[PDB]
Scaffold this active site. Structure first.
Site, short mmCIF file in Angstrom:
data_model
loop_
_atom_site.label_atom_id
_atom_site.label_comp_id
_atom_site.label_asym_id
_atom_site.label_seq_id
_atom_site.Cartn_x
_atom_site.Cartn_y
_atom_site.Cartn_z
N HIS A 193 -64.50 8.80 21.89
CA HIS A 193 -65.19 7.52 21.88
C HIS A 193 -66.08 7.34 20.66
N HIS A 194 -66.31 8.40 19.88
CA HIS A 194 -66.90 8.26 18.57
C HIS A 194 -65.90 7.78 17.53
N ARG A 234 -74.79 0.78 8.90
CA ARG A 234 -75.55 2.01 8.84
C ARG A 234 -75.52 2.61 7.44
N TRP A 253 -74.88 13.67 8.39
CA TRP A 253 -74.91 14.78 9.32
C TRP A 253 -73.50 15.24 9.67
N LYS A 277 -79.16 11.59 40.11
CA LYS A 277 -80.40 12.23 39.69
C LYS A 277 -81.55 11.23 39.59
N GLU A 305 -72.80 19.04 22.64
CA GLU A 305 -74.08 19.25 21.96
C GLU A 305 -75.16 18.31 22.48
N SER A 327 -88.10 17.42 37.06
CA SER A 327 -88.02 17.68 38.49
C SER A 327 -89.24 18.44 38.98
N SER A 364 -77.01 32.44 16.52
CA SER A 364 -78.23 32.57 17.32
C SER A 364 -78.07 31.93 18.70
N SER A 365 -77.46 30.74 18.75
CA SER A 365 -77.28 30.05 20.03
C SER A 365 -76.28 30.77 20.93
N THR A 419 -75.28 10.69 36.94
CA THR A 419 -76.65 10.52 36.44
C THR A 419 -77.47 9.61 37.35
N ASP A 455 -88.05 41.73 31.89
CA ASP A 455 -87.64 41.19 30.60
C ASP A 455 -86.16 40.79 30.64
N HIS A 513 -83.09 15.05 7.67
CA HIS A 513 -83.86 14.66 8.84
C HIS A 513 -83.05 14.79 10.12
N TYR A 560 -75.38 16.94 25.30
CA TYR A 560 -75.88 17.24 26.64
C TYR A 560 -76.70 18.52 26.66
N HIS A 615 -70.02 16.14 21.45
CA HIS A 615 -70.46 15.63 22.74
C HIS A 615 -70.96 16.67 23.74
C1 HEA Z 1 -78.90 12.03 23.30
C2 HEA Z 1 -77.88 12.40 24.06
C3 HEA Z 1 -76.86 11.42 24.45
C4 HEA Z 1 -76.74 10.82 25.69
C5 HEA Z 1 -77.57 11.02 26.92
C6 HEA Z 1 -75.66 9.98 25.64
C7 HEA Z 1 -75.22 9.20 26.64
C8 HEA Z 1 -74.07 8.50 26.62
N1 HEA Z 1 -73.32 8.31 25.50
FE1 HEA Z 1 -73.51 9.06 23.74
N2 HEA Z 1 -74.25 9.16 21.96
C9 HEA Z 1 -75.04 10.18 21.53
C10 HEA Z 1 -75.49 11.16 22.37
C11 HEA Z 1 -75.82 10.92 23.65
N3 HEA Z 1 -75.08 9.99 24.37
C12 HEA Z 1 -75.38 10.05 20.13
C13 HEA Z 1 -76.27 10.94 19.30
C14 HEA Z 1 -74.72 8.95 19.70
C15 HEA Z 1 -74.72 8.39 18.31
C16 HEA Z 1 -73.46 8.90 17.59
C17 HEA Z 1 -73.74 9.36 16.18
O1 HEA Z 1 -73.76 8.55 15.29
O2 HEA Z 1 -73.44 10.62 15.86
C18 HEA Z 1 -74.00 8.44 20.84
C19 HEA Z 1 -73.22 7.34 20.82
C20 HEA Z 1 -72.42 6.97 21.83
C21 HEA Z 1 -71.47 5.97 21.80
C22 HEA Z 1 -71.18 5.09 20.62
C23 HEA Z 1 -70.16 5.74 19.69
C24 HEA Z 1 -69.92 4.82 18.52
O3 HEA Z 1 -70.88 4.64 17.60
O4 HEA Z 1 -68.99 4.05 18.56
C25 HEA Z 1 -70.87 5.92 23.03
C26 HEA Z 1 -69.81 5.00 23.43
O5 HEA Z 1 -68.89 5.35 24.13
C27 HEA Z 1 -71.46 6.92 23.81
C28 HEA Z 1 -71.22 7.26 25.10
C29 HEA Z 1 -72.25 7.60 25.94
C30 HEA Z 1 -72.38 7.25 27.34
C31 HEA Z 1 -71.46 6.43 28.19
C32 HEA Z 1 -73.53 7.80 27.76
C33 HEA Z 1 -74.04 7.73 29.18
O6 HEA Z 1 -74.21 9.07 29.65
C34 HEA Z 1 -75.35 7.00 29.44
C35 HEA Z 1 -75.58 7.18 30.95
C36 HEA Z 1 -76.81 6.46 31.43
C37 HEA Z 1 -76.76 5.67 32.47
C38 HEA Z 1 -75.52 4.88 32.78
C39 HEA Z 1 -77.99 5.46 33.31
C40 HEA Z 1 -77.64 5.70 34.77
C41 HEA Z 1 -78.33 4.68 35.64
C42 HEA Z 1 -77.77 4.25 36.75
C43 HEA Z 1 -78.62 3.65 37.82
C44 HEA Z 1 -76.27 4.22 36.89
C45 HEA Z 1 -75.82 2.80 37.22
C46 HEA Z 1 -74.32 2.68 37.11
C47 HEA Z 1 -73.77 1.84 36.27
C48 HEA Z 1 -74.41 1.55 34.94
C49 HEA Z 1 -72.37 1.36 36.52
N4 HEA Z 1 -72.46 7.57 23.10
C1 HEA Z 2 -83.44 14.58 16.91
C2 HEA Z 2 -83.51 13.31 17.29
C3 HEA Z 2 -84.16 12.29 16.44
C4 HEA Z 2 -85.51 12.11 16.24
C5 HEA Z 2 -86.60 12.92 16.87
C6 HEA Z 2 -85.69 11.04 15.38
C7 HEA Z 2 -86.84 10.53 14.89
C8 HEA Z 2 -86.96 9.33 14.25
N1 HEA Z 2 -85.88 8.65 13.76
FE1 HEA Z 2 -84.00 9.02 13.91
N2 HEA Z 2 -82.37 9.92 13.43
C9 HEA Z 2 -81.70 10.73 14.30
C10 HEA Z 2 -82.21 11.05 15.54
C11 HEA Z 2 -83.51 11.30 15.71
N3 HEA Z 2 -84.44 10.54 15.01
C12 HEA Z 2 -80.47 11.22 13.70
C13 HEA Z 2 -79.49 12.19 14.31
C14 HEA Z 2 -80.38 10.64 12.49
C15 HEA Z 2 -79.29 10.81 11.46
C16 HEA Z 2 -78.27 9.68 11.52
C17 HEA Z 2 -77.33 9.83 10.35
O1 HEA Z 2 -77.40 10.79 9.63
O2 HEA Z 2 -76.25 9.03 10.26
C18 HEA Z 2 -81.56 9.81 12.35
C19 HEA Z 2 -81.85 9.04 11.28
C20 HEA Z 2 -82.80 8.09 11.29
C21 HEA Z 2 -83.00 7.11 10.34
C22 HEA Z 2 -82.17 6.91 9.11
C23 HEA Z 2 -81.00 5.99 9.48
C24 HEA Z 2 -79.90 6.10 8.46
O3 HEA Z 2 -80.14 6.54 7.36
O4 HEA Z 2 -78.74 5.45 8.67
C25 HEA Z 2 -84.07 6.35 10.74
C26 HEA Z 2 -84.61 5.21 10.00
O5 HEA Z 2 -85.09 4.26 10.59
C27 HEA Z 2 -84.53 6.89 11.95
C28 HEA Z 2 -85.57 6.53 12.73
C29 HEA Z 2 -86.39 7.49 13.27
C30 HEA Z 2 -87.83 7.48 13.35
C31 HEA Z 2 -88.75 6.39 12.85
C32 HEA Z 2 -88.20 8.63 13.96
C33 HEA Z 2 -89.62 9.03 14.29
O6 HEA Z 2 -89.72 9.22 15.71
C34 HEA Z 2 -90.12 10.30 13.60
C35 HEA Z 2 -91.47 10.70 14.21
C36 HEA Z 2 -91.35 11.90 15.12
C37 HEA Z 2 -92.02 12.00 16.25
C38 HEA Z 2 -92.61 10.77 16.89
C39 HEA Z 2 -91.85 13.24 17.09
C40 HEA Z 2 -92.61 14.41 16.46
C41 HEA Z 2 -92.24 15.68 17.19
C42 HEA Z 2 -93.11 16.66 17.36
C43 HEA Z 2 -94.15 16.94 16.31
C44 HEA Z 2 -93.29 17.22 18.74
C45 HEA Z 2 -93.08 18.73 18.76
C46 HEA Z 2 -92.73 19.18 20.15
C47 HEA Z 2 -93.45 20.06 20.81
C48 HEA Z 2 -94.89 20.28 20.47
C49 HEA Z 2 -92.89 20.71 22.04
N4 HEA Z 2 -83.77 8.00 12.29
CU LIG Z 3 -70.40 10.70 22.49
#
Ligand code: HEA
Ligand code: HEA
Ligand SMILES: [Cu+2]
Ligand SMILES: CCCCCCCCCCCCCCCC(=O)OC[C@H](COP(=O)([O-])OCC[N+](C)(C)C)OC(=O)CCCCCCCCCCCCCCC
Ligand SMILES: CCCCCCCCCCCCCCCCCCCC(=O)O[C@H](COC(=O)CCCCCCCCCCCCCC)COP(=O)(O)OCCN
Ligand SMILES: CCCCCCCCCCCCCCCCCCCC(=O)O[C@H](COC(=O)CCCCCCCCCCCCCC)COP(=O)(O)OCCN
Ligand SMILES: [Zn+2]
Lengths: 269, 107, 59, 48, 353, 117, 535, 58, 100
Positions: G292-293, G440, G129, G321, G245, G258, G159-160, G318, G94, G64, G247, G243
């Site tokens: 930080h992971h 987890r 994963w 924006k 990825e 926008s 592909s990417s 951010t 094209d 999943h 973004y 990380h």
């Molecule tokens: C989906 C894409 C995505 C995005 C957008 C981000 C956004 C950020 N992530 Fe990442 N992150 C992931 C992907 C992403 N992350 C994923 C998938 C995980 C799970 C890891 C996994 O298990 O593999 C993870 C988990 C994760 C962790 C936990 C790691 C762990 O489990 O220990 C951390 C901690 O450092 C982190 C960092 C951040 C930070 C600081 C941001 C920031 O960019 C968030 C920024 C948002 C804002 C801050 C809003 C801005 C609003 C304002 C008005 C600013 C105001 C100013 C202040 C707040 C001072 N991320």
């Molecule tokens: C890609 C981002 C993503 C998405 C979409 C989701 C979708 C959901 N995820 Fe998350 N989830 C992850 C990120 C994401 N998850 C990741 C990375 C893991 C793995 C973590 C691990 O391996 O450690 C995970 C695993 C995970 C687990 C298992 C946790 C574990 O085993 O430790 C669970 C269980 O509660 C959960 C919750 C859900 C639920 C209820 C949804 C529901 O939202 C599902 C329903 C889906 C929809 C609501 C959207 C349908 C989309 C389309 C049909 C739209 C198509 C688009 C176009 C037409 C343009 N997710």
């Molecule tokens: Cu990160």
């Protein structure tokens, strides 16, 4: 745009490719290669003549692409000044990507060279592994590469002064000056004391100097297709992009080898 | 409509950049031949003659490391021959490049 | 300690390090609540005032 | 022949079998494959 | 612990070259461009004596505060005299920070093999300032790192004045030694050519892509040859570095296009990196072999030899470019850099004392 | 496949752009080996004629319905982007003039007419 | 034969985007049913649906993760919206390398087959994963499952890479007559800044995966600690890809929002140059932080302090924006159509899911939240409610132009509200379960974690109903879609102004800032014969 | 005639009415073995990936 | 940077040169898109501009936009006691007197 009979010719300098079947066949060959290599390594097939068919079909698929790349440029005549710039930008962005694979392999060397574990008694090249002396055949390969980098400059400066015998001879000398590198480096892999499985040291030494081997078979092929396409009069004095890409690919490999010789062969302590 | 005439000031610019490639590539072509026939061939010749003697004196210290018994081979450490998955080509105790004269795996 | 059934917040502490963790989290939540309330109030003003309006300040 | 039903890989109107069957079977396979995978790997490991 | 000092010195050198080089996006021009380098050249020997008296950490943060207030006075300055005063205080802050930071990396890392690696990492900040958008993310990253440094140095453990336990050799005794001067001359004559090449390049010939390959090659060169210089011998690295600087400098007059400068510029920057990371640890080695171990005045001499090129460069380079021209200037500096390279062999084994 | 051109006044298609041949033992010149849309640029640049134009829109005078700006095209439509009479005042607004209707640019007001060549 | 040369042997860039959409729909259905399988097992304490098998729970979670990180969000955001819209926005006919576009499509159906065949030949691939080295060896997973799953991450990488080089090469030299690279639209900048990270991140992943393969099957011992290696190295070589990825998944969303904010609120975007500089800063500062992971692996005390400092800095670009989107929506007139509903539901939920990232950035606070459901609740508010919402908004924005057939407004609104309610019910009590201490990747849990697991199993059944209603919306779009343009005035791209009369408006209907909405709506196969003109 | 058939094959690849990859009277020798062996290579990896899901080894 | 006395001259010059209904509605649309309300002199020019092109509904819709631009009700009635000889000479009726 106010030239008289302008409607009869294309109004923008870009190439519209005709319909070709090769993307599907490359993917169907990589399907077979991936599944056969995943299966033969754990049983399930036994006979090792399906993997070789998969590799042969992949390489023939790239060769069959490059035929239609050549015919669209020397016969149809659709390569303007803009399309050549696009091809050069494209090739530079693959050379850059093929450099960054070596960065990860170099960082896999410095993460163990500086700070070795306790299982290996803390020492590079560890006890019981005799390394390769860098005052032997790894000097000959370096001087052959520096000479091959010098001979192709006599080949690119003889196609601009319109001397034909002087472009063929230099490319021939370069093609025999890369075959000797492979022949020397296959003799340095049969007279060694340590294998791919004998340490973390024998496992990273045959994985950074083995990718270079595959990357230098490609220069032998690319220089054969640059000698053979010059013998049959395809290269003009201002429109040659097969030579320019083979020159940029050779020099990057020389610079990479000069970093695979100070870090891998000389520095051990 | 009226046809666009050609500027005769952008015509000489193109015909100068095509005759200045024939020039400036008259001395460089003869220079890089002498860099490739006088300081590139003796280097390869001297290093080939040196390495032939060096690695032909080592070709008689390896012909005797084959009739050595299993109790006179150098001792094997840990981490030394990792066989934890058997190789799929031939026997599982041999890699791609494997000469018995330099390398052995003592059980 | 033991987990509680319908839990909302942390478990109870027995070490100074966990008390420092709790105090730092409660210090960060102040500024995050301030930022979220500011953003939510601006969207509320935008929805309440400037929805289906005749005048567009496009400069 | 450029028009509103020309850029799609499948035919929609003037068709023998109505479009509801190919539209439904696509989603049926898409939400039926990962139950078949679980059924196979459950039956290979003893449990019902 | 020990790595936060490396972070502080890296950021100090980054802010040094950022406030030196980057003044235009963020004769009168010859005097105004060289206002910082000469005042740094004058006030460098004083800080080497000051760090023996009051200690290492206080001049670093004093220089950071002086640099901040001088930049904020330079922000809204219109008159010429106040602008000259502002850039003078900017230079005198940047003279404290680099000297005291390099001395404290010399003091903490006592082992000879680690010192070369750490200073090879630390000298890489001299090209990130040349390479360097909005820049407000990076300033607050720097502010956070210096907050960490201030917390560890002044808050958790108390700090007194605490003068050093041993008394160092004076500056004239160091200047009577031949080895320290001849080590400093390598850095000076290596940086002189790249100092003079910058103003005469708009005369001969967009702007960022000519300077980018040197900034790419410098980091790779210093971070690789900081580690590998211990086994190869530092004198050999200095000799090869000066040779490659000379050859790449003579490669420029044969080039007749902007895109032909990319390949020699790499051969500049990597080479001068292998000049720096080889030769700046070994000065701190020599005092451990022949003198008493106080590292302030010696790195003051090293910073003098670094900044002499940027002080003398553009003012003499414009006069030579008006007098003779670009290719003969490049020819004479290349022959000087090649000719200096034989005599760096003398640092193989100095006599101990 | 037919008679070879010497200047771009004698080019009525892709059938007039093959050229003569090189000789045995000579590196060939681009005037002896070029066929398609490459030789057409070559015969344009040795006279001074730019075949592929890169000159932007007229940003001097406005557009009245009596005196409109004439945009030249070989089709019945051409996409025209207006951004102002001092060339950066108006934002980017795109318009499609046609042989049956003139565009008029809802912010600044310039009128565009299509000239069919 | 004409079917083959036009939908299998293709050159046109807009005809591969529709195939990408059809593939992405299937690969987003499969993972959603796999998520419903997981959430129906984590409902009440005991062993409910999977009888006793803790394998075929980790396999479902792994498959999943992979099917929606690699097979849904990237093909939709790169293939359907990047291949189709970027030539029309920059004004090209094209792409520059069309055969590479065709191979970048056709490498993915062989990548689906190997992943689906990594769950039938054996126990399976329950490595998670992140395929960590000492679990995914030959002592726990001994079979052709992990090997066939790490060959599905090579083809997607190729592909990417081939798509990213095409995107960078096209926008440099295939623009129209009067566009410099400062008048480009924001979506082109989003695609460029994700295509640079695709170059700079994927070699490290390919190297790490290949060295894991060599450790598994050629007994090399890069990451085995009985021969002189460390597993932690792999973690470095994974997260340097990881990380960038995350973004890559979110930058193409931003630009889409926008356009909607620029359209249905009739104002230009506040500070476009600040926005492109903010995207550049976010793209650059995603490469200098990766550790930080990994705060609990045993790093130094002076290295955690660097990675807490370099992580909180990303909040500064951010916010520019977000506040610029508020300043764009402030002054103008707002009409609530179905793209702007998803636009309004993205500016609030991305903020809520992103403010949790500041709490997790501290190394002192990560000791209480690592490998806990707080992380899951953090990244589901940003992945499911930030990227999928942008995808739905982009579909409902650009589908009448591409297809030529309109849709029912009411059913789309019902779908949006069902998604909103069900997804906000599903992922919010995960924060409470994380704060109380639930780890987890566990099938069975202690009895204290029961009650919230009863509530988060209820929202998933709401969201699947919304997916089925979306399927019916597509069916009602394709059949009788010509007659769905007079039901509501949502079909109008822009509304009449105050002084603009209806008779004047019917003559001059479309006012735009891009080339997109002035085309005929089926877009022509060859859409530019004569070049476009910009002043 | 001579080695300059370039001015002869450029009048053939233009005005051909066949695709480029099958225009010369030599493309049979390249295209028949390639498509012949590809249909065996694909048909062998769809027999060994279905035999292997049922547990049969060799 | 633009002041009141330059706005109320530039829009008078623009309103005294329109030739069609598109142009009158164009200048009227971006006049009500600033922070400055239009002067009573500019609106008096806009009604003559609407008289030259002979449109009635636009001359009514000008007075309806003033009710939305102006902050209070007293200022709106202060606008209508000075634009009265313009209304009763041309003949323009407000919306609340027509009840459409
Ligand atoms: C989906 C894409 C995505 C995005 C957008 C981000 C956004 C950020 N992530 Fe990442 N992150 C992931 C992907 C992403 N992350 C994923 C998938 C995980 C799970 C890891 C996994 O298990 O593999 C993870 C988990 C994760 C962790 C936990 C790691 C762990 O489990 O220990 C951390 C901690 O450092 C982190 C960092 C951040 C930070 C600081 C941001 C920031 O960019 C968030 C920024 C948002 C804002 C801050 C809003 C801005 C609003 C304002 C008005 C600013 C105001 C100013 C202040 C707040 C001072 N991320
Ligand atoms: C890609 C981002 C993503 C998405 C979409 C989701 C979708 C959901 N995820 Fe998350 N989830 C992850 C990120 C994401 N998850 C990741 C990375 C893991 C793995 C973590 C691990 O391996 O450690 C995970 C695993 C995970 C687990 C298992 C946790 C574990 O085993 O430790 C669970 C269980 O509660 C959960 C919750 C859900 C639920 C209820 C949804 C529901 O939202 C599902 C329903 C889906 C929809 C609501 C959207 C349908 C989309 C389309 C049909 C739209 C198509 C688009 C176009 C037409 C343009 N997710
Ligand atoms: Cu990160
Ligand atoms: C015929 C089929 C050829 C298939 C080629 C690709 C797959 C090869 C996998 C490795 C197989 C192997 O065992 O390689 C062995 C060789 C030589 O190693 P050896 O045979 O053990 O040498 C010992 C010699 N003695 C000491 C006895 C004299 O070691 C090598 O030189 C192998 C180099 C492989 C480099 C791979 C690098 C991967 C990382 C980069 C990822 C990029 C994508
Ligand atoms: C998978 C392996 C990598 C696949 C990529 C192969 C290398 C990239 C090829 C770059 C070619 C760029 C290009 O378009 O050049 C054309 C020449 O093609 C060519 O003929 C270049 C030859 C490429 C042969 C590649 C062989 C590698 C396969 C070895 C695998 C082991 C131009 O033609 P032109 O314009 O210069 O002609 C002049 C007319 N007068
Ligand atoms: C390793 C995978 C990446 C290698 C691809 C490098 C391709 C560089 C050469 C290049 O960019 O040219 C394109 C492909 O040529 C080529 O060189 C074809 C190489 C295709 C290799 C496919 C990957 C197999 C593994 C032109 O392709 P085009 O036909 O669109 O140019 C249409 C106009 N003449
Ligand atoms: Zn305009």
């Amino acid at each position: 745009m106010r030239i008289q009979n302008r409607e009869n010719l294309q109004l923008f300098p870009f190439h519209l490719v005709t319909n070709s079947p090769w993307p599907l066949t490359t993917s169907l060959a990589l399907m077979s290669l991936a599944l056969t290599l995943g299966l033969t390594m754990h049983g399930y097939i036994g006979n090792h003549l399906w993997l070789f068919l998969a590799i042969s079909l992949v390489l023939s698929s790239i060769f069959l692409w490059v035929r239609d790349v050549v015919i669209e440029g020397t016969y149809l005549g659709d390569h303007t000044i803009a399309v050549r710039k696009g091809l050069n930008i494209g090739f530079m962005l693959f050379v850059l990507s093929e450099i960054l694979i070596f960065a990860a392999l170099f960082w896999s060397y410095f993460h163990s060279a500086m700070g070795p574990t306790i299982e290996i008694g803390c020492q590079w090249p560890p006890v019981g592994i005799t390394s390769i002396k860098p005052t032997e055949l790894p000097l000959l390969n370096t001087i052959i590469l520096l000479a091959s980098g010098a001979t192709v400059t006599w080949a690119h400066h003889s196609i601009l002064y319109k001397d034909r015998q002087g472009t063929l001879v230099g490319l021939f000398i370069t093609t025999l000056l890369i075959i000797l590198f492979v022949g020397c480096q296959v003799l340095e892999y049969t007279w060694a004391t340590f294998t791919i499985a004998d340490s973390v040291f024998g496992s990273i030494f045959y994985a950074g100097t083995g990718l270079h081997f595959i990357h230098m078979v490609m220069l032998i092929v690319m220089l054969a297709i640059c000698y053979a396409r010059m013998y049959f009069y395809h290269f003009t004095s201002n429109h040659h992009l097969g030579l320019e890409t083979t020159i940029l690919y050779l020099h990057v490999l020389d610079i990479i080898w000069l970093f695979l010789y100070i870090v891998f062969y000389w520095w051990g302590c | 409509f009226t046809t666009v005439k050609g500027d005769p000031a952008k015509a000489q610019a193109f015909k100068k950049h095509l005759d200045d490639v024939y020039h400036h590539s008259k001395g460089t072509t003869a220079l890089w031949k002498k860099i490739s026939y006088f300081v590139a061939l003796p280097a390869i010749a001297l290093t080939a003659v040196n390495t032939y003697f060096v690695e032909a004196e080592h070709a008689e210290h390896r012909a005797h490391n084959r009739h050595l018994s299993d109790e006179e081979w150098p001792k094997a450490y840990p981490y030394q021959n990792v066989r934890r998955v058997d190789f799929f080509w031939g026997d599982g105790d041999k890699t791609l490049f494997w000469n018995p004269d330099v390398n052995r795996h003592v059980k | 300690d033991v987990p509680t059934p319908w839990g909302i917040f942390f478990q109870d502490s027995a070490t100074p390090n966990m008390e420092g963790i709790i105090e730092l989290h409660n210090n960060i939540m102040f500024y995050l609540v301030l930022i979220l309330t500011f953003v939510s109030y601006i969207l509320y003003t935008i929805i309440y005032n400037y929805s289906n309006a005749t005048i567009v300040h496009k400069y | 022949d450029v028009g509103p039903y020309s850029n799609l890989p499948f035919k929609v109107k003037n068709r023998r079998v109505p479009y509801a069957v190919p539209h439904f079977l696509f989603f049926a396979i898409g939400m039926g494959i990962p139950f078949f995978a679980c059924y196979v790997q459950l039956k290979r490991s003893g449990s019902i | 612990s020990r790595k936060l000092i490396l972070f502080i010195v890296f950021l100090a050198l980054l802010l040094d070259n950022m406030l030196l080089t980057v003044v235009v996006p963020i004769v009168q021009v010859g005097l105004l461009f060289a206002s910082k380098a000469t005042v740094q050249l004058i006030t460098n020997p004083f800080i080497g004596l000051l760090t023996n008296r009051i200690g290492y950490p206080i001049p670093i943060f004093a220089g950071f505060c002086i640099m901040f207030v001088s930049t904020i006075m330079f922000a809204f300055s219109s008159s010429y005299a106040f602008l000259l005063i502002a850039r003078s205080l900017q230079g005198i802050g940047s003279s404290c920070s680099s000297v005291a930071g390099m001395g404290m990396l010399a003091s903490v890392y006592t082992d000879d093999e680690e010192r070369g690696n750490v200073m090879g990492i630390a000298l890489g900040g001299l090209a990130m300032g040349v390479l360097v958008g909005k820049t407000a993310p990076f300033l607050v990253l720097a502010a956070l790192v210096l907050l960490d440094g201030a917390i560890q140095l002044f808050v958790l453990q108390p700090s007194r004045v605490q003068p050093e336990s041993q008394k160092g050799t004076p500056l004239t005794t160091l200047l009577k030694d031949p080895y320290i001067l001849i080590a400093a001359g390598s850095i000076c004559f290596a940086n002189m050519g790249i100092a003079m090449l910058e103003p005469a390049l708009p005369i001969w010939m967009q702007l960022g892509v000519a300077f980018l390959p040197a900034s790419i090659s410098y980091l790779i060169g210093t971070n690789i040859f900081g580690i590998l210089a211990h086994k190869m011998g530092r004198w050999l690295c200095a000799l090869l570095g000066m040779i490659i600087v000379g050859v790449s400098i003579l490669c420029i007059p044969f080039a007749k296009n902007i895109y032909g400068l990319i390949a020699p510029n790499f051969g500049v920057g990597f080479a001068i990196g292998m000049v720096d990371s080889s030769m700046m640890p070994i000065m701190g080695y020599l005092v451990d072999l022949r003198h008493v171990s106080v590292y302030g005045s010696v790195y003051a001499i090293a910073d003098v030899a670094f900044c002499m090129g940027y002080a003398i460069g553009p003012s003499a380079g414009g006069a030579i470019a008006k007098a003779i021209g670009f290719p003969w200037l490049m020819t004479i500096i290349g022959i000087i850099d090649i000719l200096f390279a034989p005599l760096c062999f003398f640092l193989r084994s100095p006599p101990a004392k | 496949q037919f008679k070879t051109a010497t200047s771009i006044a004698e080019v009525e298609g892709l059938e007039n752009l093959v050229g003569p041949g090189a000789k045995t033992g000579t590196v060939p010149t681009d005037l002896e080996q070029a066929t398609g849309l490459e030789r057409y640029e070559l015969l344009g640049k040795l006279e001074g004629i730019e075949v592929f134009d890169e000159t932007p829109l007229e940003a001097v005078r406005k557009g009245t319905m009596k005196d409109p700006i004439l945009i030249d095209s070989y089709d019945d439509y051409r996409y025209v982007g207006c951004t102002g009479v001092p060339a950066d005042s108006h934002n980017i607004e795109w318009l499609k003039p046609t042989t049956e209707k003139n565009a008029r640019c809802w912010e600044c007001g310039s009128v565009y007419k299509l000239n069919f060549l | 034969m004409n079917y083959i040369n036009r939908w299998l042997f293709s050159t046109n860039a807009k005809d591969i985007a529709v195939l990408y959409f059809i593939f992405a729909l299937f690969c987003g259905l499969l993972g959603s049913i796999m998520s419903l399988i997981l959430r129906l097992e984590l409902s009440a304490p005991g062993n409910q649906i999977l009888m006793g098998n803790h394998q075929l729970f980790n396999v479902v979670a792994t498959a999943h993760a992979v099917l929606m990180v690699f097979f849904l969000v990237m093909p939709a955001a790169i293939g359907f919206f990047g291949n189709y819209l970027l030539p029309l926005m920059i004004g090209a006919s094209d792409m520059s390398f069309a055969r590479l576009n065709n191979i970048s499509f056709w490498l993915l159906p062989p990548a689906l087959v190997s992943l689906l065949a990594s769950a039938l030949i054996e126990n399976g691939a329950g490595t998670g994963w992140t395929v960590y080295p000492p679990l995914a060896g030959v002592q726990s997973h001994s079979g052709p499952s992990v090997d066939l799953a790490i060959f599905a991450l090579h083809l997607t990488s190729i592909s990417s890479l081939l798509g990213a080089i095409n995107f960078i090469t096209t926008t440099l030299n295939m623009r129209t007559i009067g566009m410099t690279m400062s008048k480009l639209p924001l979506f082109v900048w989003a695609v460029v800044f994700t295509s640079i990270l695709l170059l700079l991140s994927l070699p490290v992943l390919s190297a790490g995966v290949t060295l894991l393969l060599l450790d598994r099957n050629f007994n090399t011992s890069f990451f085995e600690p009985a021969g002189g290696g460390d597993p932690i190295l792999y973690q470095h070589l994974f997260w340097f890809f990881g990380h960038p990825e995350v973004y890559i998944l979110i930058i193409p969303g931003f630009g889409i929002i926008s356009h909607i904010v620029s359209t249905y609120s009739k104002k230009p975007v506040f500070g476009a140059i600040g926005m492109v500089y903010a995207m550049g800063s976010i793209g650059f500062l995603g490469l200098l932080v990766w550790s930080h992971h990994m705060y609990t692996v045993g790093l130094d005390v002076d290295s955690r302090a660097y990675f807490t400092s370099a992580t909180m800095v990303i909040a500064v670009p951010t916010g520019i924006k977000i506040f610029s989107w508020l300043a764009t929506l402030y002054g103008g007139s707002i009409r609530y159509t179905t793209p702007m509903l998803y636009a309004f539901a993205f500016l609030f939920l991305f903020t809520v899911g992103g403010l949790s990232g500041v709490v997790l950035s501290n190394a002192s606070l990560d000791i209480a939240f690592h490998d806990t459901y707080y992380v899951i609740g953090h990244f589901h508010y940003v992945l499911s409610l930030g990227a999928v919402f942008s995808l739905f908004a982009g579909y409902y924005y650009w589908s009448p132009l591409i297809t030529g057939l309109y849709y029912n407004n009411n059913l789309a609104n019902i779908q949006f509200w069902l998604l909103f309610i069900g997804t906000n019910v599903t992922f919010f009590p995960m924060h409470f379960l994380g704060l109380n201490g639930m780890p987890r990747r566990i099938p069975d849990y202690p009895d204290a974690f029961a009650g919230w697991n009863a509530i988060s199993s209820f929202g998933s059944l709401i969201s699947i109903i919304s997916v089925i209603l979306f399927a019916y919306v597509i069916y009602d779009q394709l059949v009788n879609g010509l007659t769905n343009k007079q039901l509501s005035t949502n079909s109008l791209f822009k509304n009449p102004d105050f002084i603009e009369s209806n008779i004047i408006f019917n003559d001059n209907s479309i006012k735009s800032s891009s080339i997109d909405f002035l085309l005929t709506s089926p877009p022509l196969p060859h859409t530019f014969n004569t070049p476009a003109i910009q002043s | 005639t001579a080695t300059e058939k370039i001015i002869e094959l450029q009048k053939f690849y233009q005005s051909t009415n066949k695709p480029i990859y099958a225009a010369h009277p030599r493309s049979k020798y390249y295209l028949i073995p390639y498509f012949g062996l590809l249909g065996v290579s694909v048909a062998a990896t769809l027999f060994y990936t279905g035999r292997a899901c049922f547990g049969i080894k060799d | 940077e633009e002041t009141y006395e330059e706005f109320s001259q530039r829009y008078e010059k623009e309103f005294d040169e329109a030739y069609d209904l598109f142009e009158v509605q164009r200048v009227l649309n971006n006049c009500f898109s600033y922070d400055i309300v239009p002067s009573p002199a500019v609106i008096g020019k806009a009604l003559n501009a609407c008289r030259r092109v002979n449109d009635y509904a636009t001359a009514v819709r000008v007075f309806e936009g003033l009710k939305h631009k102006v902050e209070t009700k007293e200022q709106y009635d202060a606008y209508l006691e000075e634009l009265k000889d313009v209304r009763e000479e041309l003949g323009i009726d407000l919306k609340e007197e027509l009840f459409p």
